Amino acid sequence: LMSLDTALNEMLSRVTPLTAQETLPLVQCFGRILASDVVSPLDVPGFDNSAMDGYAVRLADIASGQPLPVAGKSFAGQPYHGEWPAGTCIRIMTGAPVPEGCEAVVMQEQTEQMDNGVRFTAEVRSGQNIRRRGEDISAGAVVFPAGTRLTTAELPVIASLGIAEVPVIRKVRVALFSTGDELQLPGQPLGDGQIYDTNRLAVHLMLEQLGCEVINLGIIRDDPHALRAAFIEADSQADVVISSGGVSVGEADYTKTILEELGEIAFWKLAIKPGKPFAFGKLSNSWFCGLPGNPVSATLTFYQLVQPLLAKLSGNTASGLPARQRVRTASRLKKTPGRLDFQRGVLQRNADGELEVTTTGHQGSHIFSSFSLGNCFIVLERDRGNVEVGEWVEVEPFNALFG
Amino acid sequence: LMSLDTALNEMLSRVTPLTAQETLPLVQCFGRILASDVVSPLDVPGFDNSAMDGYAVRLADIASGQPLPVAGKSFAGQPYHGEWPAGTCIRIMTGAPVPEGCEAVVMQEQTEQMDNGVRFTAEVRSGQNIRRRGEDISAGAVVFPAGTRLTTAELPVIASLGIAEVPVIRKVRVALFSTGDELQLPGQPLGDGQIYDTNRLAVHLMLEQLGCEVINLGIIRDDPHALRAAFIEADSQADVVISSGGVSVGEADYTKTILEELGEIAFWKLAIKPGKPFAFGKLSNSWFCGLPGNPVSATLTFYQLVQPLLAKLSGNTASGLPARQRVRTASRLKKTPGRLDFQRGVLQRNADGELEVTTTGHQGSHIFSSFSLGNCFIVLERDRGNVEVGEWVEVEPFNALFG
Numbered sequence A, B: 001l002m003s004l005d006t007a008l009n010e011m012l013s014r015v016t017p018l019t020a021q022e023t024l025p026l027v028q029c030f031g032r033i034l035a036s037d038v039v040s041p042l043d044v045p046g047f048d049n050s051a052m053d054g055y056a057v058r059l060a061d062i063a064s065g066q067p068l069p070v071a072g073k074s075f076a077g078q079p080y081h082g083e084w085p086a087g088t089c090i091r092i093m094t095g096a097p098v099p100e101g102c103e104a105v106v107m108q109e110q111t112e113q114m115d116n117g118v119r120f121t122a123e124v125r126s127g128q129n130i131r132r133r134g135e136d137i138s139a140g141a142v143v144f145p146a147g148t149r150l151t152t153a154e155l156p157v158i159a160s161l162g163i164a165e166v167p168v169i170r171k172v173r174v175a176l177f178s179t180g181d182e183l184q185l186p187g188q189p190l191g192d193g194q195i196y197d198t199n200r201l202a203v204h205l206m207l208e209q210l211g212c213e214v215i216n217l218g219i220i221r222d223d224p225h226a227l228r229a230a231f232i233e234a235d236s237q238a239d240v241v242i243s244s245g246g247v248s249v250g251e252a253d254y255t256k257t258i259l260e261e262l263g264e265i266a267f268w269k270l271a272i273k274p275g276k277p278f279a280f281g282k283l284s285n286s287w288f289c290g291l292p293g294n295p296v297s298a299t300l301t302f303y304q305l306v307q308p309l310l311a312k313l314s315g316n317t318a319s320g321l322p323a324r325q326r327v328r329t330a331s332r333l334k335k336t337p338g339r340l341d342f343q344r345g346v347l348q349r350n351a352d353g354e355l356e357v358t359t360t361g362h363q364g365s366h367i368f369s370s371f372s373l374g375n376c377f378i379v380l381e382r383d384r385g386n387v388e389v390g391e392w393v394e395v396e397p398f399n400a401l402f403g
Helices: A002-015 A155-160 A201-209 A226-237 A254-261 A296-311 B005-013 B057-064 B154-161 B198-211 B224-236 B254-262 B293-311
Strands: A019-023 A054-057 A070-074 A087-091 A104-107 A142-144 A166-170 A171-181 A213-220 A240-245 A264-269 A277-282 A289-290 A325-329 A338-348 A355-359 A376-380 A390-398 B021-025 B054-057 B069-074 B089-092 B104-107 B113-116 B118-119 B142-143 B165-169 B173-179 B213-220 B242-243 B262-270 B277-282 B287-290 B323-329 B339-350 B356-359 B376-380 B393-397
Touching: A002 A277, A002 A296, A054 B254, A155 B293, A171 A201, A201 A213, A201 A240, A201 A296, A201 A338, A201 B154, A213 B104, A226 A240, A226 A254, A240 B173, A277 A296, A277 B054, A289 A296, A289 B142, A296 B154, A338 A390, A355 A376, B005 B277, B005 B293, B142 B154, B165 B198, B173 B198, B173 B224, B198 B213, B198 B242, B213 B224, B224 B242, B224 B254, B242 B293, B277 B293, B287 B293, B339 B393, B356 B376
Parallel strands: A070 A087, A171 A213, A171 A240, A240 A289, A325 A355, B069 B089, B173 B213, B173 B242, B242 B287, B323 B356
Antiparallel strands: A019 A166, A054 A087, A054 A104, A264 A277, A277 A289, A325 A390, A338 A355, A338 A376, A376 A390, B021 B165, B054 B089, B054 B104, B113 B118, B262 B277, B277 B287, B323 B393, B339 B356, B339 B376, B376 B393
């Protein structure tokens, strides 16, 4: 019944971005959120310089319509600090500081030389080919705003300004655990109607990849006290606590009563597929997210619900989810109205070089293979029914969490 | 003159993937390359279970036509081993072991409660809703092939099979350093015609993100011996050695003679933009990659040349570079024939929901901002000249290294 958009907004609207911070050397800043604006301490370039290599001139002598002889020259880091006779021009090479009083620079290709004077050609519009100091970055200016996720794109720029460290928001801390007597650890023998715990591993990997500090409390035994203990501990050192499975997401049982006892938890029924149930609310000092037991369902719910909440909490101003794009289906897709279906597909280039999607196969949640075989989500609109080969469809490519 | 494709093939063809390996617990395997095939130790599913929530029935009981009292139940970790007499049914939850003798399983909707048992409204087909032991993964089968990069998509599947660890190829070791008296460290005062070293930081970040073990030797002083020492050490504990700048990529000088003295190094002139010069060859026990001094150039060369070499060396069987797609330009693009131009652009959805690219602005290599403003490469064909708004163009979206 409830819609993804609704739950998402309801979730993000209640959360307050972290503000605690620490200062680290650039090399340790990948994926981190800048705590404050980065203001440039210097100008870049620090002085007016040549856009092309050619000739530095004064709009005056260009009226002579006669050859201008090179009085001097200015290169890389060897400016021309000398007298500039009238009617003459300076030989200059890109990045080189324009000469005192230079009104324009001309690319030699736009000026046939001579063995006695430089003949110009196309009029020389003022300021042509002159990069003015602070044109790129002017001292005092804001280079990168707070809330920016530092990447290979920004850190080297910050280093170019001479800064060795920057304040970043502390990593988000997340407590993780599962519960259920039927859950067994890898390496351990499978009991009667037992199964190996897999959701927890899934959530742990994603959290780490998302840059969070993970606190894995393991499998909690089916006991009212063990569970309460687990929650008290999780809430005490994490901003968010996640149940990868076992704790109630609606159904009645002791886990449900412990949840209601320890916080304000809502039990939503999202109109999505796979999945539907999701637990969300506030514990004493953390946010709680409860995932359904089904592997496909938990992964999907975490990826579309928890991920965005972690992005906001982190201080990051960009919506930490990939963008969608319209593409054509090359597979008939089975879809039932009433739920927003996040099917898995395979985005690929066709013969004509265009992008099309193929289903990964069976979309049932009884298997996990679709995540490996696919590379995207074919997000089918809630109201839509079956889709025929050739129809337009929305696609959301997987991010680094899946390859 | 030489083409990207050529150099790439020439490079990959000479390299041999690493084979050394180590075994680690799944949680430490993200981004790692599987050293050997993963063979499933059991059938999946592990035992006939229920595809839904409802009741286990037998065609005969359903046949009689009247209510079937609930002789018992079967839950997650609670398989029913009761008696199950004629004319009765067993309540069953999803994933629950189907009871012995179970011939089918009906869901709620097809059920209507009674005061003297349960009523089955809809038709019940033989074998319906019973997931059969092994209908997904058969024991002895190969689940994931060696050379596979482990992700959230695969690791939880491997955990579902009970396996706690897997052999993976050891991380690729890379030695990194720069040289040049003009290079200054962050925090340190800028000398005369000095500049802050930025390429090294850039390469270090990317390498770490690519999953490599980085050995940063810092800035090497302009001395024939200091440089030789740096190389001897780098080559002695790395599979690849990278010069982020300073060492020759063609031009004549002492760094060139040390290179030629320590290995078989080729000095290529690629028909690409930005960039052109690239040094590649074999040292005593490693591969050497030499990057041009310009920041934009070094980044681009590393990203399109070194990255793919690292992917192969790692044992990974998938081409570690993003795919391209055809999109329309919404910006006039200035392009000169003769070089494959990797311009930076901004991929975005337009009013009609279609994808289009906009230039980030000036494509000159005198600035680094394009990497931050953009989100992709507009890969312009070597022979192509200017591009007008509305033309078809090839786009390569940035990967995690840039956001």
